[PDB]
Amino acid sequence: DAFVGTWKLVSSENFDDYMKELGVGFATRKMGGMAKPNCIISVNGDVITIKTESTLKNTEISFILGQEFDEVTADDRKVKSTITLDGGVLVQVQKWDGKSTTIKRKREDDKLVVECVMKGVTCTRVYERA
Ligand SMILES: CCCCCCCCCCCCCC(=O)O
């Protein structure tokens, strides 16, 4: 849809603080901090796939909106994830060990804007089409 495409990271604010708030260690934070991933979003029927590709780490999720799924995150958390579409925003919640984090993906002008929140930390990541 508006989301389908291949997207390259062009800016990131507060990602180190976000990773720290998630409990990510120095080594995994080091890998993530200067990474410039591509995010490849596709859809087949009910199933949306989001691939995140970078030199040192790749991830992929496939899901149906509103259906919880198990996910191993890029930082190796074992979480239960649910993704819904609310006002054109893909809203992902991840739940583990009594905690939660949200990842909200929206289209704004030429940008795919990704807001990641853990407790009082808000990170904003911007991708543009490859
Ligand atoms: C790209 C490599 C980063 C690996 C470090 C751990 C990151 C875990 C949280 C990732 C949140 C997703 C943000 C996004 O899709 O831009």
For residue 25, the surrounding DSSP H or E stretch is none
Under 8 Å between Cβ of 89 and 106? yes
Q: In the structure, which protein residues have their CB atom closer than 6 angstroms to any atom of ligand 1?
A: 19, 24, 28, 31-32, 35, 37, 39, 52, 54, 57, 73-75, 103, 114, 116, 125
Instruction: Give the three-class secondary structure for 28.
Output: helix
Handedness of CA 39, 44, 85, 74 (dihedral sign): negative
> Residues with Cβ < 8 Å from 127, sequence gap 6 or more?
7, 8, 9, 10, 39, 111, 112, 113, 114
Under 8 Å between Cβ of 57 and 77? no
CA distances from 35 to 9, 12, 16, 17, 103 (A): 9, 10, 11, 15, 18
Instruction: Specify the CATH class of 7-129 in words.
Output: mainly beta
Q: Which atom of ligand 1 is nearest to the CA of 24?
A: 6
Resolution (A): 1.1
Answer yes or no: is 18 a known binding residue: no
Tell me which residue of 89, 81, 83 sits closest to 46, measured CA to CA. 83
Return the domain boundaries, the chain. Answer: 7-129
CA distance 55 to 64: 28
